[PDB]
Amino acid sequence: ETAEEIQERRQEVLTRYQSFKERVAERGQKLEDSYHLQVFKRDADDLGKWIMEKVNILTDKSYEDPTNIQGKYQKHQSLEAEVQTKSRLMSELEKTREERFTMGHSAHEETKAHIEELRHLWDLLLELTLEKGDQLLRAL
Amino acid sequence: GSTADKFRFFSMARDLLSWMESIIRQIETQERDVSSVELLMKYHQGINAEIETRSKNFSACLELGESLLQRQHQASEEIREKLQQVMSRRKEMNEKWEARWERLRMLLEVCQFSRDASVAEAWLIAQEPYLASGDFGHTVDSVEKLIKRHEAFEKSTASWAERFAALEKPTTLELKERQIAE
Numbered sequence: 440e441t442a443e444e445i446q447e448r449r450q451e452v453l454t455r456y457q458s459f460k461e462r463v464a465e466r467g468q469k470l471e472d473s474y475h476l477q478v479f480k481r482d483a484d485d486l487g488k489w490i491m492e493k494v495n496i497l498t499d500k501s502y503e504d505p506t507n508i509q510g511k512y513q514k515h516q517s518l519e520a521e522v523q524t525k526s527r528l529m530s531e532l533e534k535t536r537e538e539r540f541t542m543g544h545s546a547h548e549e550t551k552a553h554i555e556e557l558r559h560l561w562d563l564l565l566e567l568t569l570e571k572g573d574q575l576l577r578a579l
Numbered sequence: 580g581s582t583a584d585k586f587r588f589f590s591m592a593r594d595l596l597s598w599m600e601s602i603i604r605q606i607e608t609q610e611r612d613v614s615s616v617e618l619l620m621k622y623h624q625g626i627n628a629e630i631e632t633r634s635k636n637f638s639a640c641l642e643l644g645e646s647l648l649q650r651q652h653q654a655s656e657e658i659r660e661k662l663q664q665v666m667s668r669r670k671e672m673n674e675k676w677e678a679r680w681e682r683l684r685m686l687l688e689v690c691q692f693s694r695d696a697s698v699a700e701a702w703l704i705a706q707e708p709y710l711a712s713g714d715f716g717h718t719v720d721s722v723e724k725l726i727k728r729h730e731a732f733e734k735s736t737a738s739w740a741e742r743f744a745a746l747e748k749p750t751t752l753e754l755k756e757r758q759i760a761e
Contacts, residue, residue: 440689443752449696455703456743463736464712467729473715481719504675 451560475539476546480530483553486528490560493522496566511576529561585654588647591640594694598633599668602626604677606667611682615690627676640665688750695746702739 440446475496505511533554540550606625644662650654705760709732718721 440693443689445751446757448687449693450746452700453743453746457698459703459706464735466710467726469715470722470726470729474719474726477716477719479720493594555591 453485467532472545475566476550479535479550480542480553482528486525486557487560489525490557490564493518493564494560494567497564497571508575508578515565515568515572515575519572522564522568529557532557581652582641584647585658586691588640588643588658590663591636591643592665594663595636596639596668597631599672603668603672603675606679613686615694615706617683617686617690620683620687623680630672630676637669638666643693645744647720685751688752692750695742699739699743699746706736 536550536554540546544550606623609619609622641662644658644665647658648662652658712724716725
């Protein structure tokens with residue numbers, strides 16, 4: 440009730456509300472950023488696990504019993520398919536990294552690192568499936 | 580009947596003139612100014628109620644006055660003036676009542692608006708703890724929980740949009756400035 444035309448300085452004391460709205464928008468945004476990052480990380484890690492499971496099956500030369508080669512070749516062909524279809528997930532992650540975590544993003548280097556770790560694991564799988572494969576081809 | 584009538588006319592005027600001065604003083608007496616909530620609303624209107632009660636008296640006084648003047652009573656001049664006087668103090672009374680009544684509505688705004696502000700200001704202080712956190716999750720599950728908590732939080736925030744929106748529109752106090760400003 441001071442300088443009643445001047446009172447409206449209390450209205451500018453309302454600006455808090457503007458600073459309040461902005462901070463709400465920021466928290467939400469940051470939470471969204473964290474969501475996409477965590478979701479990515481988990482998908483990447485899971486892809487890592489998946490690859491290692493395959494790699495372990497391929498290198499378990501320390502063996503089961505089996506000796507039918509034509510059939511062994513089928514189990515192997517079926518494995519190459521699994522890899523092919525799953526390869527699509529690799530692409531999607533690369534695409535996601537390129538597009539959703541670009542220059543000007545906190546997780547640019549972190550999300551680039553994961554995709555690099557998988558590229559390396561991917562190579563390993565490819566070498567091992569190609570090698571197991573090749574033995575079978577030679578054994579008929 | 581002439582002397583009785585005349586005498587009676589002046590008796591009524593005097594009585595109404597005394598009563599008006601009392602009521603006019605009744606208006607100004609209360610100060611300019613309620614703290615927060617104004618019983619002055621009830622108090623000021625009560626005065627109007629008393630004014631209505633006199634309505635007949637005026638008519639009576641006024642009529643007698645007029646009839647007396649029509650019938651060429653030879654106190655006519657003294658009569659004319661006293662009935663102007665009563666009529667003058669009548670318009671003046673209702674002008675000074677209504678004059679104030681507009682203001683009772685005017686002060687009503689600040690008391691309400693001011694309170695409205697402190698309540699809002701207080702509520703924003705209250706949300707700080709939540710809104711201060713630096714937890715954003717370290718896991719899909721954790722972040723999903725925080726987003727949903729935020730979703731709840733924003734909705735309740737949304738409610739106040741109206742409450743704040745009201746404080747946007749200006750006041751009659753500030754509106755009247757146009758007449759003072761221009």
